[PDB]
Each structure stands twice: as C-alpha cells, then as structure tokens.
Symmetry: D2
Subunit: 396 residues, 4 copies
C-alpha cells in the first residue's frame, strides 16, 4: 500500500530537516505575515528540503513516509508558521484525496509529479459556494462560477476541482488551464499566507481524461463508495487537529522564550527572578499538559485513519463511525487547547509583550481563524449523539 | 462639591450624546486603527460633544456629572472604540488625580481649563521608568529621562508629571513646555490609538507654582496622606474595569450584528434560520449574563469610590482596604468576562467573519492588550490574602 | 402598599438577627443534614426570631421589609444551611405568590396569619405531575393524585394548591385539611431538610371560599393576566439566585475557616505558613470576586422585580421580557459561581478536609442539587435568542 | 518481569474485568453507604485472577504488563472507585517491592502474590508526626500513628516505609487498625489510621534491593524515585476510570430515566442539543487523558526495565510526562463527575440514583497532592530548565 513509512532512525533526520525549516520560517514569520504576499518563497523552501515529497512513495522519488510521520512534520512546521504549516498539511491531504479519488494510472501521474517534480497540490473544495454551473460537452466539462477559500490554489501546480452535483465530479487540472482567475481578496485575521482567496472559473474546461474515477471500483449500492470518499473529510479534520496543536506548541514556546529573555518580575512577587513566578509556572504547566494530551490523542487517531485507509474494502458503517468519533474527539480537544494556549499566554508574558515587534498574537490570529472552519459545538454534539442514540456518524 | 452628578433625565440626554459619538467612532474604528495615527480628530469629536467637560462642575462650564455617570458614558464610548474609550476614561481619571493632588487655587485653574476651554488631560505616571532624574532650581525643577506608556500625552493640553513615591514631586505643565520629545514607538497589538508611546524629557522645567500641594493638608505621620493619595491608583483600576466591560459589550453587539446580517446556518443544524442555532443562543446568552454581572459590580464599586473621595478625612486603613478589595473584585471579574467575550465570540460568527473587512478581532486586541497592564493573578491573590490573613490592601 | 421596606439602620438590626440565626444553624448543619428529619425545630427558630414575618406589613405584626431586604436575609441563612435557606426564601416567594393571586380580602387573611400568627407558607406547584384529577363540587373542588417536589408542605401551616388545567385553579388550605398524606420519600443528595417529598391528595376539598381570585381584575384578552401571573415564576427564579449565592458564600467562608484553623503548608511551597500559599490566595480571590459580581446583579434584579410588582397595571410585553432577561442573567451567573465555588474549594482545603467530620461537601451537595431545578443552558439560550431574534421571553 | 500478555489474550482479561465490574457496580451504592471493610471485594478480584495479573506465569500469575494492569484498573475503577484504588495500589505495591526487594526477596513476594492470592498494602504517608522507629538487636521497633494506610487493614503482606523499608505479615503483633475512616469518597479503601505498638521488623525482612545502586551519583535516589512516579501514574488511571464510569452512568440515566425539557425542540430527551454537546465534550476529554496516560505508562515500563537507574534527564522527562498526565486526568475527572448532573436533571439527585458517588470519589482522591504544584513543576522546567528530581 501507499504511505508505508520511513524507519525510526530516518524519521529523526526528517524531524531535524523540519526543525531547520521551522527556525528560518519562525525568524521571518512576523514580517511575512504583515506583507500578506503569496507564499511562493515559502513553498520553494519546503520543496528544497524534500518536505513536499515526504509522503510520496520512494518509487517516485519521495521519502515514503507515513501519514502519522507526515502530520508530525506538519506540527513542527505549523509551530513556526501557522500559514505555511496549513499549506503543507493541505498539500499532504490533497495527496490523500487524489489517492482516494484517482485511478491507478491517475495515481501514478500524480505521484511522479509530486515525488520527483516538486508539484504542490491545491484543491477547490468548498461545497457552500452558490452560482456554480457545470455542463458536460464532448471535450469534457465546462465550469463557471466563483469559488472561495481556495487554499494554496494560487501557488499550486496541480489543482483538484471538486464539484458537488447530483453526480459529483472531481478532476485534476494544471495551473495554466485557461479560465482560472485568482482574485486578490484574501486579507484575513490569521492564516494570511495560505492563499485562501477566491478563484473565478470563466468557462474552465475539465478534460475527460482528467476526471478522477478511483471511486468507481467501490459499490454505489451498499454505501462503500460514500464511506471510502468520506475518508477525505475525516483526514481533513485530522490535519486541522495537528495544525491546531502545532500552533499551540509554537505559542507556548514563544511565550516561554519571551519570559526567559525579556520578562520582568512583578513588584508584588516574592522573587526577583521572573522565571520563579508561581502563577507563570502553573499556567505554563497547565497549558503544556493540555497540549501533550491533545498530541497523544492526535497521533492515536491518525494511526487509526491509516488502518482504515489500508482496509482491503471500504470501512463499514461501524468502522467509519468509530473512526469519525475518534477524529471528532481529537478535533474537540485540539480546538480547545489551541484556543486556550494562544489566548492565555499573554497573562504570563505581560504588558510590554503586546508590542507588534514581539507579535505573540500571530498564534492566536492563526488558531482563532482556522478553528471557525466548522463549528466546534457540532463536532462535540456528534460524539454525544452517538452516546445517547447509538447512531454512528455518517458521510454527509 | 466635586462630581455632584446630573439629574436622571439630563443623564439620559448625555447617554444619547455618547451614543451619537459611539456610532461615528464605531463606523471608522477599523480604518483609524490601521492608520495608527495620533487621535487628534477623535479628541476634538469628544470635545465638540461636551464629553471632555462632562465630569467638571457647572460653574466652570461643565455638565456637573458624577464619576458613576462619567464612567458609564465611558463604557458607551469604549464599546465603539477601545482606544478612544481608554483616552476618555484616562482623561476623567486624570481630573480625579489633579483634584486629589491640587491645592484650592490649582483645582480651580484646572477646572476652568477643562470645563470651559476644552483641555484634555494626559499623565506621565509609570513608576517603573528607570534613569529618571530631577534637579531643583530657583525657577522650579528640571526633569530628565524617558517615560513610557504616556497615554494621551501627545494629544493632551495639560500634562500631569508624577515623580517618585516616597517624597513625590507632582506637577502640571502645558503641552507647549519646552523639552518634551514624543517618540514614535507605539505600534501595539491593541489600544493603538491611545498615544501610549514614550516621551523624552530634555531639561523640562516644572515651575514652583505648578507643583501640586493638595496633599499637604493630610498628615504624613498616620498614613492619611498615603491613603488619600492612594485613591488615585484605585480609580485607575476602576476605569480599567469599565473600559474592559465596554469593550466586552462592543464585541458582543458586533458579533450579534454579524450573525443577524451576514450569518448563515450550519448544514447540520435543525433550523435553516441562523438566529435559531441553539449553540449560538446559549453562548451569546452566557456572555451577556457575565457582562451584566460585571457592570453591576463595577457601578457599585464606583459609587463606593465616590463616597470615599467625598469623606471629610482620608479613609482609614479598613475603609481603604475594603474599597481596594471591592475594586480588586471588579477588576478580576471585568478582566475575565472581557477576555471571555472577545475570544469566544468567533465561535458563533464563523469562518467568513475572520476577514479583516469585518474586523471582529479589534475588540480582542484591545482587551487582550490592556488586561496585561497589571497581572490578573496578583489582584486575585490580594483578595484571597485578605480572607486568609486579615491584612487589608494598603497604599504602595 | 406591600413590601415597602424598613429603614437602613433598622435593616442592620435584622441583619444582626439573621447572623445570630445563621451561627446556630451552622453549628448543627452537618448533624441535622445526616439525620434527614423534617425541620420543625428550624422553622420554629426562624419564627422566634421574626424572620417568617419580616416581609409582611407592620399593620399585621410583620416587620414591613421589602423583597430586596427579605432575600438578602435569605442569603445570610442560606450560607449557614442551604436547606433552611431554601425554606425561608420559598416561604417569602409563597407570600409573593398569594399576594399576586389573592383578592383583597384573601390577602388580608394571609397577611394576618403570616404577620401575627407565625404561619409558614408552602405550595404544591409542580406543573409536570401527571394523573392529577380535579372535579368541581357544590362545596368547592375535590382534588386527587400525587404531587412531587412539595417543598415545605409537610411543615407549612398554609398550603397553596396550584392546578394547571384549561382554567387554572389556585387555592389555600390549612395543613389539617383532610386527605393530605405526606410520603417519607425524600432522601436526596442535597437540600435534604427542605421536605421536598411527594404529597398524596385523597379527595381533598378546595372550598370555593378558598379559591384565589386576585387575577380576575387583569384582562385575559391582551395578555395582562398572563404577565401578572408570570411574575410568580420570575420570582421563583430570583429566590434561586439568592439561594445559590448564599450557599456559595457559606462554602467560601467554610473553606477559608478550615485553611486558617486546620490547614497545613505543602512541602514544595515557599512558605511554611499555609495562609501564604499563592495558589490558595489566588483561587479564593477569584471565587470571592465571582460571588460579589453575582450578588450585585442579584440585588439589582430583585429591585427591578419590585418595581414591576408595583406597576399600576400588568407589565407590558417589553417590561415583562426585560425583567425576564435580567432574571435569566442573574440565574446564569449565580448557577455558575455557586457550582464553581462549592466544587473547587477542595483544591485549597486539601486531603484531610475530605473527612465527613469536616463536611465541606454539604455546600456542593446543596448547590449541585438545586441547580438542576431547570436546565441552565435553556436559561442562557433565552437571553441569546432575544439578542438574535428580538423576541422577548413570555409566560410559558 | 511485567512482560505482558498477547493482544488477543488481553481482550479476554478485559472481559474478565468487565464481569467483575458488573458485579461490583450492582452493589456499589449499598457497600459505599455501609462503609465496611472490602473483604469480599478483594476476594472477588482474587478469584478472577486480577490480583496476580501482573505476576509472571512461573509464579502462578498471568504475566501481564503494567500498561495492561492499569488498563484493567480503569475498568474496575469505573464500576467502583474504592475497589479500583485498592487494585492499582496493590499493583503499585508490587512495583515498590520489586524495586525495593533483593532478588531472593522478589521471589518470596512473587510466589505469594502469584500463587497464594496475597494482597499487598503500604504504610507510606510521609506527613505523619510522632512516628518513632527504635533500633534493637531483636530488630526494629516502630511506634506512632500513621494515617491514610490504604488497604493495610485487608492486606496480607504489608510494606512499611520509614531509609528503613521492610515487609511484614498481616499477623505481626502491634498492628492496631483504627475505625476512623468516615470519608467523603474512597470510603471502601481501608484508608484509616494504623497504630504501631512496638512492632518488630526483623533483619531478614528488611528490603535491600536498592543497595546495588550507587548512593553517590544519585542512581539510588532516581531508581527509588520510580515508586513515587508510579504512584502518580496509578492516580491518573484511577481518575480516568472514575470519569469513564460517571460519563457512562450519566448517559445510561438519560437514556433510561431522562425526560425532555418543555422548551426543547424535540420530545426525545436523547436529541437535546445541550446534552449531546456536553457529553461529547466530556467524552473527548477522557479520550485525550487516556491516550496520554497509556503513553506515560509505556514510558515508565521502559524506565523500570533500564536495568541501570535512569539519568537525571530520563527521570526528569518521565516525571514531566507523569505530571502532565496527572494534570489532565485531574481536570477531566473533576469536570465529568461534577457537570454530569447538568444533563441528568433534578430527579437524578435522589440518593437511590447515587450519581454523586463518582464525584465524591474523584473529588476526594484528587486532593492527595495539590494539582497546582504538579502543574507548577512542568512550567518551572520550561522556564528554568530544571528537571524534576527525587524529592
């Protein structure tokens, strides 16, 4: 199967690669965030260090890492820069999507380009966009309409277009396909460097040989195709989990670093050593403990996703539902702890730390932004609904 | 005497004036916040609507409002713009400071300027500024050194300069006084339009007639002078309470306004009406309740401060301690709810609300910044310390 | 008219009476709680000290106190014994109920009994009791069935029987009225001494002279009668607020007392004095601040209720809804802080405090029990619904 | 030692623990209110092989690991917090005597615990004044009063920690078990006080396992420190077990006795949006605590199996991991057992329902050592680089 994984010794080296990339991204995060430019240089930095091809099989020039390993590297990157961290994990997830959606020949085309040609994958997947028209011609499909939240599409080399019709249509197109217009309407609270602006489709052609047909081998009668395709949405929730935990780890380390370097003791405190303040220590310890719990659950849930992905068949209703519950559980804890850390870190760093030259708020802006992707109470509700009614979460 | 208050019907008219000002500030808050300019226009707006002279007696051209009424108008302004709200309450507090510190003739000089000539009062009061020197000459005192967090000084007409704590030297100087250099080093997370940058004193003269001597009539032997002077710091904490609550009220109203105008229902919700989501309603209702509790305690603590200020003598150790405990309580509650509201409002507003064209984060940036003025756990510790040891809070 | 209030100096004397009663109840609270007996002696203690007649006009032998003052006395009693505090405020609320529902001659009959004859008022008002049959007789009404949560009925001298039919029937009957059986089925977590067991109705007679007719002067066409009657349910929510805050004050005081008398320092702590522990002080200060906020909002809400009760007409749609919103706000904050205090106090008191001879849990058992009377999230939801839809709460 | 059984074999042990849990949960309220010594419950664990689960098969045990043993502890703790504490304290006492005992002493204990149903108790409260040990050629004479002696009144082999560490039979003269345990929760843990009236500790019974570790470089201190770290670990699993039992009890009450609120959109109580959200939040919290707890136990097993004592960094890193697990497990167990009543309702507060037994249990034990100081240790290491060390 795909996503075989690298050895423990080799992954330690890939963690050092990610740490090297994280240090450089971290030193320029505030300047780049303020500039709000498309992250071309940052994508090139990820490409040059072999991180874009990490989750591609070694046959195609990738490292052959597992999804657990890939998202763990994503946490290291997301801790330095939430925006570039989101781009990396979305790229990995887009590869998981086209692996699920692609035929074997289509899978090979994508893996060769991602593994050995530096392709960055983006997708147009927002299902709430109105005014989208799609018509079928002999040449292929003609798509018209404006799509929003198109993360990484303006910097991607291969674009996955997902259309939510009565019969859904998913296709892969190159970046230079005519009719694509990228609007400069992304000026957001956080995740500013993710290129999540809107994309205009002006009579865009999706060729017939570009339509993904991997789901055809799964039964459209017993729900196998829906549950196989539903793994895409479950993995998207998992990358969000690791993204939030990565941002939380960066905010905690940044707050710790500010206190050790610039912190002044409070005059009412017993000690003149700011590092000995009892309230700073308790608060940082509570947050650190909470992150560790979220990470432990995250890595457990990601391993369970890999097992479901490697099933010889589509997961059953109970297998899919149990995995969705675990993903829901990881999503709930990761959202709460990341919001908790990025929000309350200022209570320990103090008044002078609120200067934009310090920029401790970038973690909050990033965490607070992406946590609104889908509402937290409804993911918690799904867990409790299963406890009260025995009904499994279903691909919606 | 001072801060007698206007009638209930007249104050309803002043609340109407504040609402008119709040609407204009709210509509331009985002654009002004980005430009980061000194708030000269906003102070003239406060001036032309009579809000700067509201807390000055009618004999000087003011409205004759009370401190309870003045801080209530402050909450209305602070809800529209946290920065301008801070300036207004800091101005009111600076009048209370010079009332406590000023002689009879000095009080009338300031009241006539603030009451009938539009003077805005700023203060240089940070006690943690090192390297400050003062030399007494035949004409007065020559002051040198850099002072930080000089809120409103760059836009003030009358500046109060406070030096030391043991043998203090407090004086009022005009904005035209030679030697004042305003550094352009205020680029902050929030409270950006408060003019809280640093100020350089280059051989600044404080004339002998400008030295405040109101504290002379209080005994320096039994602590009466310290407890009378200590009312200034308690009133600072009090305006912080009202500022935080105003900001929290603005964030709640802005989130409600967004949901009603731009909100859309979550597809998993039972209702297609976004205003009927049970989690939006529950969250907003919890936040609304917490704000109301904070306001009830805040206005009660302000009334208790007015009574202590109007005492014929300085408040005793127990009177000062009980007032400080109640102000600590209001500070703790107002800190917690304002951080709660401004952080969690995004859970109800959704992903599209994170655009900077919406700017719902300005309330968080403002509250998150100012709540770090002095650390929350130590104000809570002071309350618990009194309960466990019987030791009242005492002036510094 | 009614609930006019006593003077400030005289209310201090009544607060001294309540403190004396609270001290005695507090010393026997644990023993009486475990015995689970009907609080006949405690009702007689309240009677001897004039607390049962405090809210009755002076012409009838009562003190002439207001509802604000009466519930403030209830908080003092509730802090010593949550069960006895609930009985006192239920007695007051039952007096408010019969004041709304009673005719002028019926009001005088009850006031003369409660004011000068020591009557304790209980009610049978649970609207969720099924299988309750009531048939009209020439003599009056015959009522059969089982009613639950009949707080204080087994110790009441005057019992209000509320029947929720197509035409609601409310009447007052003596405790010796034939057909009343008191089942020994009240063995609860907390509120154990409130006599909240079930009561059987064996063909009980409600004479026509006993049917309360005070609501007849209010129109049943424009909602006046519904909103006038709805003040009863709003006052029930108000007494719950004060009950919860009193329990929280008692729990905070009991924890402070244990720490000062029995507390030992933690070996890792900086100080060998347990009263100097920074985490004890911080937590106790946060809890103290939260209680003070809830109290300030509670007393503000009670005053607004008194104004509504004294309206020349029934409250309008807007007047009733605004009062319901404020009571909802007070109910939300009082529930949260009382559960917060009684649950978290053990973190400061330590391991030895968990002995049943200490009995710190009685506050939690009491607060945790009564806060389930009606679900908190639906009260918060009502506030958020008004913000989002503009719909005022209405009598249900 | 602590090798562990296979995955398929451990599934059968989970079912054995579920059978024991179901029987305990049927009399949980009646036994808790009776406040009697849990003699029959300890025999229940003994008959089903749970007392010898963490002992090698060569001694008559199951050959399970510490990760597996504490997982079964969570199953028992979910049904009865008191009995769950006794089981994990028994397991922890085996780890203590394994660390403290000589190779010949280890086999004596393994044969009795594995092949004769011995229950191990500990007298190990470090905050007891008046404790006095006196040396004699007869051995050692111990006098004073020790409190919180969990399981001692029902233990067969008793470890006394004074350093002087020894094991004595339950029949040793001088032991006076006082009947002063009337607590909020953990009522059936036999945690009363034990009077020592000139109790003899023979030289042959003194544990000498720590002698082979150097007392000069801190190796003996760090090796012995694993005892306290494992104590904090069994507290983690106990709190999560109680939280699991409370959540399941609240869910089962709503499904079987719950009534919809008249303001709710649905007449089905299981479709209340606030019940679902609250329970789902609590469920996710427990799941995160379990994942961290089982991770920390795996790291402890490796530390114990190092042979050599863990270094300052290895011991410190393990202690940080255990503090993190302790913090999360404390917060979620208090959260679950306290907030479950918001979803169960007014009628669920009757003592015939007894849903408060979970809160009383978790609220009691979480005060064993103060939570803020365990959190402070994590933050202190982040700010000062100082690892936790054997204190």
């Amino acid at each position: 199967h795909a996503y075989q994984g690298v050895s423990d010794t080799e992954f330690s080296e890939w963690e050092q690669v990610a740490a090297r990339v994280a240090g450089e991204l971290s030193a320029t995060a505030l300047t780049r965030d303020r500039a709000n430019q498309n992250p071309i240089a940052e994508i090139e930095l990820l490409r040059r260090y072999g991180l874009l091809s990490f989750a591609t099989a070694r046959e195609f020039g990738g490292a052959g890492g597992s999804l657990v390993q890939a998202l763990q590297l994503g946490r290291i990157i997301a801790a330095a820069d939430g925006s570039i961290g989101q781009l990396l994990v979305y790229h990995y997830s887009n590869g998981v999507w086209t692996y699920i959606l692609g035929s074997p020949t289509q899978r090979e085309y994508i893996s060769r380009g991602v593994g050995g040609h530096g392709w960055f994958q983006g997708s147009v997947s927002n299902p709430r966009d109105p005014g989208i028209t799609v018509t079928r011609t002999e040449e292929g499909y003609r798509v018209n309409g404006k799509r929003t939240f198109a993360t990484g599409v303006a910097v991607a080399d291969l674009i996955t277009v997902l259309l939510y019709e009565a019969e859904p249509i998913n296709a892969i197109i190159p970046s230079e396909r005519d009719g694509l217009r990228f609007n400069d309407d992304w000026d957001n609270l956080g995740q500013r460097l993710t290129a999540s602006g809107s994309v205009e489709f002006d009579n865009v052609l999706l060729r017939h040989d570009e339509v993904l047909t991997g789901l055809d081998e799964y039964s459209g009668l017993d729900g196998s195709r829906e549950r196989r395709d539903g793994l895409r949405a479950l993995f998207s929730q998992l990358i969000f989990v690791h993204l939030y935990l990565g941002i939380a780890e960066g905010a905690l380390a940044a707050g710790v670093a500010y206190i050790r370097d610039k912190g002044r003791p409070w005059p009412e405190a017993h000690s003149t050593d700011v590092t000995e303040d009892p309230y700073h220590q308790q608060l940082l310890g509570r947050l650190s403990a909470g992150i560790a719990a979220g990470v432990a659950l995250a890595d457990s849930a990601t391993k369970e996703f890999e097992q479901a992905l490697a099933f010889g068949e589509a997961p059953t209703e109970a297998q899919w539902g149990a995995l969705a519950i675990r993903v829901d559980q990881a999503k709930s804890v990761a959202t709460e702890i990341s919001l908790d850390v990025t929000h309350n870190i200022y209570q320990a760093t103090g008044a002078r730390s609120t200067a934009n030259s310090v920029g401790l708020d970038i973690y909050w802006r990033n965490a607070r932004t992406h946590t609104t992707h889908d509402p937290l109470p409804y993911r918690q509700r799904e867990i409790g609904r299963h406890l009260l009614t025995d009904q499994w979460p279903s691909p919606r």
